[PDB]
Design an enzyme around this catalytic site. Structure first.
Site, PDB file in Angstrom:
ATOM      1  N   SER A 181      -5.378   8.127  -8.218  1.00 43.38           N
ATOM      2  CA  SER A 181      -5.183   8.088  -9.663  1.00 43.38           C
ATOM      3  C   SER A 181      -3.727   8.205 -10.080  1.00 43.38           C
ATOM      4  CB  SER A 181      -5.984   9.191 -10.363  1.00 43.38           C
ATOM      5  OG  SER A 181      -7.290   9.307  -9.826  1.00 43.38           O
ATOM      6  N   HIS A 188      -0.713  14.646  -9.795  1.00 39.68           N
ATOM      7  CA  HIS A 188      -1.377  15.740 -10.507  1.00 39.68           C
ATOM      8  C   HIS A 188      -0.592  17.040 -10.374  1.00 39.68           C
ATOM      9  CE1 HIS A 188      -5.240  13.381 -10.389  1.00 39.68           C
ATOM     10  NE2 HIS A 188      -4.711  12.956  -9.252  1.00 39.68           N
ATOM     11  N   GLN A 211     -11.439  13.334  -5.454  1.00 43.65           N
ATOM     12  CA  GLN A 211     -10.628  12.705  -4.420  1.00 43.65           C
ATOM     13  C   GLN A 211     -10.078  13.754  -3.469  1.00 43.65           C
ATOM     14  OE1 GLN A 211      -8.725   9.259  -7.254  1.00 43.65           O
ATOM     15  NE2 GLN A 211      -8.162  11.403  -7.627  1.00 43.65           N
ATOM     16  N   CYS A 226      -5.011  11.665 -18.064  1.00 41.95           N
ATOM     17  CA  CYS A 226      -6.451  11.825 -17.951  1.00 41.95           C
ATOM     18  C   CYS A 226      -7.030  12.146 -19.319  1.00 41.95           C
ATOM     19  CB  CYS A 226      -6.784  12.947 -16.965  1.00 41.95           C
ATOM     20  SG  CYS A 226      -8.545  13.167 -16.613  1.00 41.95           S
ATOM     21  N   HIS A 236      -6.003  20.082 -14.846  1.00 40.76           N
ATOM     22  CA  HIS A 236      -4.942  19.280 -14.245  1.00 40.76           C
ATOM     23  C   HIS A 236      -4.192  18.522 -15.328  1.00 40.76           C
ATOM     24  CE1 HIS A 236      -6.590  14.923 -13.633  1.00 40.76           C
ATOM     25  NE2 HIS A 236      -7.252  15.482 -14.629  1.00 40.76           N
TER      26      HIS A 236
END
Ligand SMILES: OCc1cccc2c1OCC2
Ligand SMILES: OCc1cccc2c1OCC2
Length: 147
Positions: free
Chosen positions: A138, A141, A115, A97, A43
């Site tokens: 977060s 993505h 998630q 990330c 990702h």
């Protein structure tokens, strides 16, 4: 009729039909082709000021708006789809990330570990397929299913 989560739509600019997936946010012109314990994904994450943790290895304080993060994601998707850039190269350079250090690779995972929007998009992707923008706590993505 169609695989899990797909629907027909009409292009507003050209009038041609296309296909949209409301689980992955993928869109494509061609009709989608004809579940496993585990999937492996990479990702690219773009965080924003309302991310659960607004900080990353790229920036101590992430201040961009959610709308700004979506514009960045959309621009990365355009360059991946045109072949100007590779997913792995963009993830290494620009993912918020720390998996950026592994070209975005997260390794393999089961249901119930990630998630929920991320998990659902990952398992609805076919092997080799890329998502559109996927929203989680977060951030936003781009997901690539590799296995
Ligand atoms: O590939 C998994 C991985 C590699 C490097 C860093 C991180 C990872 O996941 C959470 C942060
Ligand atoms: O493997 C998953 C993972 C989670 C968190 C941190 C790291 C990881 O891998 C390398 C460093």
């Amino acid at each position: 009729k169609l695989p899990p989560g797909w629907e027909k739509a009409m292009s507003r600019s050209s009038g041609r039909v296309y296909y949209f997936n409301h689980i992955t946010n993928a869109s494509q012109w061609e009709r989608p082709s004809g579940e496993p314990a585990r999937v492996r994904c990479s990702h690219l994450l773009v965080k924003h000021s309302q991310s659960r943790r607004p900080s990353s290895w790229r920036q101590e304080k992430i201040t961009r708006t959610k709308e700004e993060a979506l514009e960045l994601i959309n621009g990365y998707i355009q360059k991946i789809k045109s072949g100007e850039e590779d997913f792995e190269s963009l993830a290494s350079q620009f993912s918020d990330c720390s998996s950026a250090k592994a070209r975005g690779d997260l390794g393999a995972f089961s249901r119930g570990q990630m998630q929920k929007p991320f998990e659902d998009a990952s398992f609805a992707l076919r092997t080799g397929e890329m998502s559109g923008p996927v929203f989680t706590d977060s951030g936003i993505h781009i997901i690539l299913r590799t296995e």
